[PDB]
Structure 1
């Protein structure tokens, strides 16, 4: 049962001390270089972020002083022979005291102090990336020594020399000839020589620092060519740049069928763009124009992973390793806002273009169905349910109707939605269960796509209306001649056809097959891959065949019954298969090829 020793017998009887928490660097450097960042090559990304922050600070200072704006760029150099990578910027610069304060202290960031000493939050607060003060020390996991050439931009400041080796001790000195800005020299480790190649650095910049506000040069060439098209006015940016941007973030070659540029910032300063791929069967998270994660399976729901684009926000909380704070107290609100906006955007797409949405729905229908089944809160399913499209029995085939518009013509007296899950419309329009509903003027929705039954059962409600399935409710031949025509038909097709009746709704089809077990009809369709032997499928399904006396084939069978008994049996077996093919019960007519070939040879014997 319960056995606990919890008690409050402890008492305070000593003298209290007052001393600060101790904080050394021997273990902090080891943690940063061994157990801080999940992946190795993020160190030059952090260096580029620091350079961009310095350039932004210098630009703010220059525009505050109201003077000219000189050149400001980030230059990347990599010597393959020397095995070193050089990054140099022309930012504000750092003095002796500034170097000691920032570089020599763990987590002490001058960017945060600059932000606190800004007091406007509109000029350059959003462009400052550095917030933790540990970005620079990421270079110690790949370098045995780091050389920094930093000089402040003040009119009279002198350069300084900074040395370190990652062992918790740094030897700062004085340097001459250092130009304005900061120059960092990194000597790669023996095991980390892979960063000495230009291609790797180019890949890193394209992955992470491809949207830096300032020009970036690697060995003297500029390759950004992407000025953060999501940060400007959606009206200003054209549709031509959307295709090029989509092909980059999604790593695809097709075009986006839809373009949603969301910029309204209710919960957070969200600047996101969403694309829908054309290729029918993933969003890259950004923060202050710096990539966070390529996959980002948290900001968006799983069922919305089919879209592509980026989500950039300048106020989301980031982890120490510059990764998203998963499932934070505020991130969950972002997912609901993004899901609601995308759902609303999709609804507006259907109204403005029904045909385009129908093509879109038939391409990503499984994604919408996946969300409803996997959704937890009921009202969330209602918004996704509005995206579903179904064809009703009261409207001609080929046009899809939404669930919301289905209730528009629904009677006030009726309170439950009727849906039928069938492989195709031919079986649904002829099933006796639908005929029971067809007696009244009510309409029933038809579900054809796979997993529709699971989605409808999981949804269980729409617009305060209970979801209930129909299955859970429960010129012409003479009459005398047609009577014995079926009697012989049930002999040859006793195992397959349960019974044959009279049909007056066949314009040009000699027969149709109809089923009373649409639930088991999908079982018949699902057995087209495993164990579809002819001698077995008849018993598991047991369908009924309907024929019309107004067709030539049915009329012709009267004389062939007695004149050519051998041909009569084969022809009836052929016409029964044709009904299944027309009704869609068989995925492919491969089995009927064997008997059809042997039928035509004797059908033209006199010819």
Structure 2
């Protein structure tokens, strides 16, 4: 019994009137403090990003004008006694009009406006982090009061103080002496006093801002120490560098047995590094039912420490970093947005890694065999779980087997088997047994021996199950010899 009330009754009768959308500013601020970020700590990531942007703008001006660069630095000070955290930078600072407009207008982004004015023809075009114009207001998560001192690098500019508790009102007054650049003093809330602890702030800086491009000093001590090697030309990164960075991003004590440094500007911008550990995972690690973990960055800022969306699940044995400007960030900057173009990135990363391994098998075959023994279970899992047959056959190119036509211990591919089939032979034949002795004593294989047919010999755990799910390769049916 279909029931509907919807029909076109409505006839606009009258004169119209036009209005502008308004906003409730005090509430928008509270949305930022309460309902936006998953963690209170990211206010440090937001303020450091602003400090980086302010220095990047100053560097752009001075290099364009032929002036010498001064100290370009970001400083953090925790005072536990006073219950404060303080960030100060030596960048462009702000005039009084800039404090009013850029701090006082929600979603107003001076750095986005700077970007648009370049025609993105300069070097800072890809180094500038801010877009949304809300990031500063993250401080009202942890702050009772926020106290800003700023002095613009422009001629004749004095210092100003900017003061707000987040009420929808701020105060501005002239101030001295203020160093060129910006100093933000955060008076922490009752439950937020942990951000006046040096140890705590240190961890927050290291987690989010570790790769920032200007020297960062916490309570007098330099920090970064870590170059973002995914941004560099691959030919410029030593093995020592890849080893130390792998130990960092993977929290591991071993070495990478494989390193793929993948940079592409099309279709998407990708700065990525992927590592395969030396150590072989245990069956417990494998069955622990995890997803992919790869740290995700944009413009050197951490997005997520382990992003599960960027690599397929069968490639969770891989450790590394992926950086992109292209893919747009969620307003909270803790995740990505458009799901189809994420999946475009994942398909590209999947194809690029399968090509990497196919190439490692041709480059060094005995090394690849050891990698297949240690990681081949993941490829078997990936073939079993995949849905599109094209994925199954791509992953299946990595598999290796013995052969009745090769000596004991010699590994072959499905491709190499296909190359060796006779003129009209339509099928890839296989036998799954614990070892080559038991395979060759199979009564079902002895029948094959009367003919000229090659038989694949599969000794690995879940080989047969994998071949039943893969079911064909290169349009040739995979047929157990035991049927």
TM range (shorter): over 0.9
Answer with 124-133 or 17-26: which moved more. Answer: 17-26
Shift of 1:232: 1.3
Deviations 1:251-291 (A, max 9, x none): 10100001111112211221111111111112100100011
Distance 1:283 1:445, change over 3 A: same
Following the alignment from structure 1 to structure 2, what is the Cα–Cα distance between the partners of residues 14 and 319?
A: 42
- Structure-1-length-normalised TM-score: 0.76
Larger-Rg structure? 1
- Does residue 466 of structure 2 align to residue 446 of structure 1? no
Following the alignment from structure 1 to structure 2, what is the Cα–Cα distance between the partners of residues 430 and 11?
A: 87
Shift of 1:375: 1.5
Shift of 1:406: 1.3
Deviations 1:173-214 (A, max 9, x none): 221101100000001111111111111111111111110011
Following the alignment from structure 2 to structure 1, what is the Cα–Cα distance between the partners of residues 26 and 223?
A: 39
User: Contact conserved, 1:159 with 1:176, CA < 8 A, in 2?
Assistant: yes
Shift of 1:9: 2.4
Answer with 4-13 or 126-135: which moved more. Answer: 4-13
Following the alignment from structure 1 to structure 2, what is the Cα–Cα distance between the partners of residues 360 and 211?
A: 31
Following the alignment from structure 1 to structure 2, what is the Cα–Cα distance between the partners of residues 112 and 404?
A: 52
User: Contact conserved, 1:301 with 1:339, CA < 8 A, in 2?
Assistant: yes
Shift of 1:168: 2.0
- Does residue 232 of structure 2 align to residue 250 of structure 1? no
Following the alignment from structure 1 to structure 2, what is the Cα–Cα distance between the partners of residues 213 and 121?
A: 20
Q: Provide the alpha-carbon RMSD of the alignment.
A: 3.5
Shift of 1:25: 1.0
1:401 to 412, 427, 432: 412
User: Contact conserved, 2:329 with 2:337, CA < 8 A, in 1?
Assistant: no
Shift of 1:225: 0.9
Shift of 1:3: 3.0
Shift of 1:422: 2.0
User: Contact conserved, 1:152 with 1:181, CA < 8 A, in 2?
Assistant: yes
- Structure-2-length-normalised TM-score: 0.95
Which structure 1 residue ranges, 5 or more long, are not aligned? 470-605
Shift of 1:241: 0.7
Following the alignment from structure 1 to structure 2, what is the Cα–Cα distance between the partners of residues 18 and 452?
A: 69
Shift of 1:443: 1.3
Answer with 229-238 or 142-151: which moved more. Answer: 229-238
Following the alignment from structure 1 to structure 2, what is the Cα–Cα distance between the partners of residues 391 and 305?
A: 27
Answer with 164-173 or 201-210: which moved more. Answer: 164-173
User: Contact conserved, 1:298 with 1:327, CA < 8 A, in 2?
Assistant: no
**More strand by percentage:** 2
Following the alignment from structure 1 to structure 2, what is the Cα–Cα distance between the partners of residues 319 and 172?
A: 32
Give the match for residue 131 of structure 1: 131
For 1:120, what is the secondary structure of its paired residue? coil
User: Contact conserved, 2:327 with 2:337, CA < 8 A, in 1?
Assistant: no
Following the alignment from structure 1 to structure 2, what is the Cα–Cα distance between the partners of residues 174 and 122?
A: 34
- Across the two proteins, how many residue pairs are aligned to each other? 471
Following the alignment from structure 1 to structure 2, what is the Cα–Cα distance between the partners of residues 310 and 121?
A: 27
Distance 1:117 1:429, change over 3 A: same
Give the match for residue 353 of structure 1: 364
Deviations 1:236-256 (A, max 9, x none): 211111000100001101000
Give the match for residue 337 of structure 2: 326
User: Contact conserved, 2:43 with 2:139, CA < 8 A, in 1?
Assistant: yes
Which structure 2 residue ranges, 5 or more long, are not aligned? 282-292
- Does residue 326 of structure 2 align to residue 306 of structure 1? no
User: Contact conserved, 2:145 with 2:164, CA < 8 A, in 1?
Assistant: yes
Give the match for residue 365 of structure 1: 376
For 2:429, what is the secondary structure of its paired residue? strand
Shift of 1:326: 4.6
Shift of 1:449: 1.9
Shift of 1:122: 4.2
Shift of 1:96: 1.1
Shift of 1:119: 1.2
Shift of 1:63: 0.7
Structure 1 moving runs of 4+ over 4 Å: none
Shift of 1:97: 0.9
Give the match for residue 181 of structure 2: 181
